[PDB]
Amino acid sequence: ADVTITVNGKVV
Amino acid sequence: FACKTANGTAIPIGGGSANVYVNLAPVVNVGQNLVVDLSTQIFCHNDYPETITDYVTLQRGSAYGGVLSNFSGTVKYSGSSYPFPTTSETPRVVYNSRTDKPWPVALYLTPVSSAGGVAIKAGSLIAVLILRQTNNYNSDDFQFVWNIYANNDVVVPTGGCDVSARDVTVTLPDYPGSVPIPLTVYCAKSQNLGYYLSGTTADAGNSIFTNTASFSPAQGVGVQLTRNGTIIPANNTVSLGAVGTSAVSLGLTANYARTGGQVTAGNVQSIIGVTFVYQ
């Protein structure tokens, strides 16, 4: 791909 | 004829091929993209300018190397542009001074993709340039090779458009919070532009990206992108209308979405690709 989006998250 | 790079390192003239390390700042332009402007990287001077006048041309067979070997373009040499790989020798640059003057060379790339890019790592070859050196006083006529290496990690734009970032990292607030994704795009000239998302989906609808978090990961949740409140599924064209020299946000927002089952506490991660297309 042209861009790579790394999403980081958390479920508390 | 004697040359040095921007950092003052001397380029040994003649002998075998020379490994010349230089800095890149690749940008898209109208009808061609800049790979490297060597005029800020290589500077040259003459030590007997009163009696001797040095002539230097770019011999045919000067071409890209490494990952760029595949591409074609042009080379702007002394204000005029020529196809690259060079099919014939360029006209000469004159070196009549003891003052270091730059080497007026810029390597360009012909656009082939919409907004693609080629990763270029530090220490890797980018061009193989053949030079021919003569003078005004005797018959000395010698050719030598300048292997041009990159001194910094960059991504050469191979299209008409350029993305604000090639690797975006966003941090979602704790579940079930959302956050915009910082990402814009612009083109050298107006392009009817669109894009779509790709990656590993969790659902049949192809609208939720799988959670690939390794340490203490969450169950039952995935990542889902929206735009103006509208869910964007994978491999779905989002039209941006006409995109020009002004940066246009993709409008993407990151969210959480339940994948089914009990939602359990832990980390969440999703790598999502973005690919641009013409319309």
Author numbering:
A (entry chain B): 1 to 12
B (entry chain A): 1 to 279
What wording appears in the published article?
The adhesin FimH at the fimbrial tip specifically binds in a catch-bond mode to terminal α-D-linked mannoses of N-linked glycans of the receptor uroplakin 1a on urinary epithelial cells. FimH is a two-domain protein, composed of an N-terminal, mannoside-binding lectin domain (FimHL) and a C-terminal pilin domain (FimHP). FimHP possesses an incomplete immunoglobulin-like fold that is completed by insertion of an N-terminal donor strand of FimG, the subsequent subunit in pilus assembly.
To establish a stable, isolated FimH molecule with all properties of FimH in the tip fibrillum, we complemented FimHP with the donor-strand peptide of FimG (FimG residues 1−14; termed DsG). The experiments described in the following were performed with FimH from the faecal E. coli strain F18 (FimHF18), which is structurally identical to the most prevalent variants in uropathogenic infection, and FimH from the wild-type E. coli strain K12 (FimHK12), which differ in three amino acids in FimHL (K12→F18: Val27Ala, Asn70Ser, Ser78Asn).
